[PDB]
Amino acid sequence: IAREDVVLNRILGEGFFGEVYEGVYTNHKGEKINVAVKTCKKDCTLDNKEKFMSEAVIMKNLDHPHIVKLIGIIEEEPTWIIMELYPYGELGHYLERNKNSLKVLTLVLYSLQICKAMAYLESINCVHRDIAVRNILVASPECVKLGDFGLPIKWMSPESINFRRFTTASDVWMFAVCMWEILSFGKQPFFWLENKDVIGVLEKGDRLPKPDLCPPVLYTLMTRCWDYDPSDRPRFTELVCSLSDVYQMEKDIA
Ligand SMILES: Cc1ccc(-n2nc(C(C)(C)C)cc2NC(=O)Nc2ccc(OCCN3CCOCC3)c3ccccc23)cc1
Numbered sequence: 511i512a513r514e515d516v517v518l519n520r521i522l523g524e525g526f527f528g529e530v531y532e533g534v535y536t537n538h539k540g541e542k543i544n545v546a547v548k549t550c551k552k553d554c555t556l557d558n559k560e561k562f563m564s565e566a567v568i569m570k571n572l573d574h575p576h577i578v579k580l581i582g583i584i585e586e587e588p589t590w591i592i593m594e595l596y597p598y599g600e601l602g603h604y605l606e607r608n609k610n611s612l613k614v615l616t617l618v619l620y621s622l623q624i625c626k627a628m629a630y631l632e633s634i635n636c637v638h639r640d641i642a643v644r645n646i647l648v649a650s651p652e653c654v655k656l657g658d659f660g661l662p663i664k665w666m667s668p669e670s671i672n673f674r675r676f677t678t679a680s681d682v683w684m685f686a687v688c689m690w691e692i693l694s695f696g697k698q699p700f701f702w703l704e705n706k707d708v709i710g711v712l713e714k715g716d717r718l719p720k721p722d723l724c725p726p727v728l729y730t731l732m733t734r735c736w737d738y739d740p741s742d743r744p745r746f747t748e749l750v751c752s753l754s755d756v757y758q759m760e761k762d763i764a
Contacts, residue, residue: 511535511582516592518547527551527562535581535592544595545581549588559589566591576627578647578657596655598648605643605696612695614723615760620646620654621689621728622753627656628685629746632678639676641665641684643691663705664698668738671709679740682749686735693721693728712738728756 518533528549535543550562569580569591579594598604601620605612624646631638638645640658642665647655667683669675687699699718700708717736720729731752737743744752 511584511592513584513586513590516545516547516584516590522546525549527554527558532595533592543581544597546593546595548591548593552588562591563589569593574627574630575653576623576655577630578655593657596647596649598650600644601646601648601654602643602691602696604648605692609695613764614693614725615757615764616651617692617723618725618728618753618757618760619652620692622750622757623654624656624688625685625746625750625753628681629750632681632746635678637676637678638681638684641681641688643688643696646688663708664700664703666708667740668709668712669740671712677740678746679743682735682743682746683740685746685749686732687718689728689732689735690718690721690724693724697721725756725760727759728753731756 515537516533516535518531520532522530522532524530525548528551531547531549533545533547535545537543548562548565550559554562563583566580566583569578570583572578572580581592581594583592584590624641628638628641638656638658640660640662641656642662645657645659647657649655662684663671665684665687667675667680669677670680670683690699691697700711703711717733720726724732731744731749735743735749
């Protein structure tokens with residue numbers, strides 16, 4: 511990818527190594543693709559440059575339908591990592607704007623798609639550590655994609671809060687919090703608490719209540735993901751099966 515093919519529009523945020531810009535990449539076909547362009551401060555250490563670069567090296571290998579996509583890297587200074595964006599933005603904000611028209615089936619679909627992404631990550635023993643609607647892009651009305659754009663106490667498992675332990679089992683907890691967000695049309699988990707109060711509530715056995723539109727069977731699955739004991743939470747691999755069941759049940763009802 512040639513730098514002249516990428517036009518930057520505005521700053522999206524301050525990344526860990528430098529600003530992230532929104533841009534338009536015009537490919538060889540002349541079609542315009544929305545992109546996020548990550549940059550790296552010039553005066554960084556060699557180790558930090560290597561870390562910056564590693565995202566490109568890693569993400570080149572990801573081609574899952576529900577994981578975000580690397581468009582390319584321009585290695586020449588200033589080094590840019592170019593990621594694919596879509597018209598619709600973050601899922602959180604998409605749910606907020608479309609709450610009056612989204613059907614429960616679609617909310618279960620998004621949940622299932624993110625679960626499939628996580629079953630892939632689980633297969634290579636990779637941990638996300640930050641599963642939430644803010645980390646999900648809407649590629650189309652029928653397709654969401656999991657990313658990592660950026661402690662999230664209100665999403666975290668008790669072992670992550672208490673010991674900073676993060677495993678696939680702690681990801682399953684967070685994923686069920688993410689499901690709760692989706693079925694709540696983007697509401698923030700424990701918005702009625704301060705971060706400091708969260709562990710006390712979880713320790714005493716309290717949990718996020720069932721979202722109004724959430725099917726009871728799906729809520730039961732969420733609660734299993736929120737078992738205090740990490741060993742009692744389902745694997746993502748099996749949760750795909752359970753969520754597929756809920757989807758088919760909801761499709762039939764429809
Ligand atoms: C070293 C390293 C290695 C791997 C990763 N990594 N790993 C994952 C998995 C776990 C899902 C596979 C995802 C990522 N990285 C990312 O997802 N990086 C990205 C960061 C910021 C972005 O845009 C920010 C701007 N934001 C986008 C959403 O809309 C509002 C603005 C992105 C926008 C589109 C696509 C990717 C983006 C990360 C770092």
